[PDB]
Write a protein that binds this ligand. Structure first.
Ligand SMILES: CC(=O)N[C@H]1[C@H]([C@H](O)[C@H](O)CO)O[C@](O)(C(=O)O)C[C@@H]1O
Length: 308
C-alpha cells in the first residue's frame, strides 16, 4: 500500500486487544480506499510496552497500546492511575484522563515531550489474583511468590499486602506458573483466559486491586505524514475500535467467572477491607515522593463521582 504501517502489542492472537486491533486495521484499510494497510505484531515480537513506546517516539513503529499509568516512567504523578483501589470504575478512569486539568496536561505532554498522539481510550479490565493455593484472606498473601509486571505500582501492591514480588515479562509467565517458579500472578480475567493461565492455576481471588485502561497511540512521525483526510480516517477508526474493545471487556467480566468454574478453577472472595487498609502507607509514600503535583492529582481523582 502507499502506507505500510505496523501495530505492535504484548497480548496474543486470542485476546480482546488483538480482536479490537484487527477491527481498527480493517476499518482503516476500507475507509482509506486501500491507501493504508496495518500489519499486527503480537506477543511481544517487537519488545515489551516500554520498548514499543520508545519505537513510537523514534518513528520505527507506527501504533501501539499503553495504559495511562505507564507514563509514570516519565511523569511520576501519573502513577495515580494505578494506585491500588483509588480508581473505582471505568467511568472514573475516563473522566480522570479527559476531564481533569491533570489528565489534559498529560495528553499534551505525550505529544510534545514523547512524540506520541492519543487517538482513543478503552477499558482493559480489572486485575484479579490467581495462585496455586487458596487466598481466603489477606493472611494467605504472606510470603506468596507473586509474579508482577516490571511496573512500580504492581510491585507495591504485592509488597504492601505482604507478598514477595517477582518481576518478569508477560511472555515468561505461563512457564513460570507451570514450573511453580512462582506461586501466582495478577491480571484481568480476560488475560487469564487468553493466555490460558487457568490451565496452570487452581485458584482465583477477586482482589479487584488495579483497573486498567488501554490507549490507542500513534507515532507523531507517522501521524504528521498523513494528509488530513487520512488523519481523520485513523482517528475515527480508533474511536470506533475503542468502543468495541471496551464492550468485549465489559461483557466478559459478566460471565468469565462461570467459564473458569467449568474449567475447574475455585473462586474466592476475600474480605477486601484489610487489603485496602494495607495500602494506606503506600498512598502516603506516593505523596511524599511526588509532592504537591501528586497530592493535587489524587485530589482531582478522588473528586470524581463514580455513578453515571
Ligand atoms: C499495554 C500493555 O502492554 N499492557 C500489558 C500490562 C502492562 O505492561 C502493565 O500493566 C504495566 O503498565 O502488563 C500485563 O498485564 C502483564 O505483563 O501482566 C500485560 C499487558 O499486555
Amino acid at each position: 500500500a502507499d502506507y505500510d504501517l505496523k501495530f505492535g502489542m504484548n497480548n496474543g492472537t486470542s485476546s480482546n486487544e488483538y480482536k479490537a486491533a484487527e477491527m481498527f486495521a480493517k476499518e482503516v484499510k476500507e475507509k482509506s480506499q486501500g491507501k493504508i494497510e496495518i500489519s499486527l505484531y503480537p506477543s511481544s515480537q517487537l519488545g515489551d510496552d516500554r520498548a514499543m513506546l520508545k519505537q513510537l517516539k523514534d518513528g520505527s513503529l507506527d501504533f501501539t497500546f499503553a495504559e495511562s499509568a505507564r507514563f509514570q516512567l516519565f511523569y511520576p504523578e501519573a502513577a495515580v492511575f494505578a494506585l491500588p483501589y483509588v480508581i473505582s470504575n471505568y467511568n472514573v478512569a475516563q473522566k480522570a484522563l479527559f476531564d481533569t486539568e491533570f489528565g489534559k496536561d498529560l495528553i499534551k505532554k505525550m505529544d510534545k515531550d514523547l512524540g506520541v498522539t492519543l487517538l482513543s481510550q478503552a477499558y482493559n479490565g480489572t486485575r484479579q489474583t490467581t495462585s496455586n493455593r487458596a487466598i481466603n484472606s489477606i493472611a494467605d498473601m504472606k510470603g506468596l511468590k507473586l509474579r508482577v509486571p516490571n511496573a512500580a505500582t504492581n510491585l507495591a501492591y504485592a509488597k504492601y499486602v505482604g507478598a514477595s514480588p517477582t518481576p518478569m515479562a508477560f511472555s515468561e509467565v505461563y512457564l513460570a506458573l507451570q514450573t511453580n517458579a512462582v506461586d501466582g500472578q495478577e491480571n484481568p480475567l480476560a488475560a487469564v483466559q487468553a493466555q490460558k493461565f487457568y490451565e496452570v492455576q487452581k485458584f482465583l481471588a477477586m482482589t479487584n486491586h488495579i483497573l486498567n485502561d488501554q490507549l490507542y497511540l500513534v507515532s507523531n512521525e507517522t501521524y504528521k505524514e498523513l494528509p488530513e483526510d487520512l488523519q481523520k480516517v485513523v482517528k475515527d477508526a480508533a474511536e470506533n475500535a475503542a468502543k468495541y474493545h471496551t464492550k468485549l471487556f465489559v461483557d466478559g467480566e459478566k460471565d468469565l467467572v462461570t467459564f473458569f468454574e467449568k474449567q475447574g478453577v475455585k473462586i474466592t472472595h476475600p474480605d477486601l477491607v484489610p487489603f485496602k487498609e494495607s495500602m494506606k502507607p503506600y498512598y502516603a509514600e506516593f505523596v511524599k515522593q511526588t509532592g504537591q503535583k501528586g497530592e493535587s492529582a489524587l485530589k482531582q481523582i478522588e473528586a470524581i463521582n463514580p455513578h453515571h
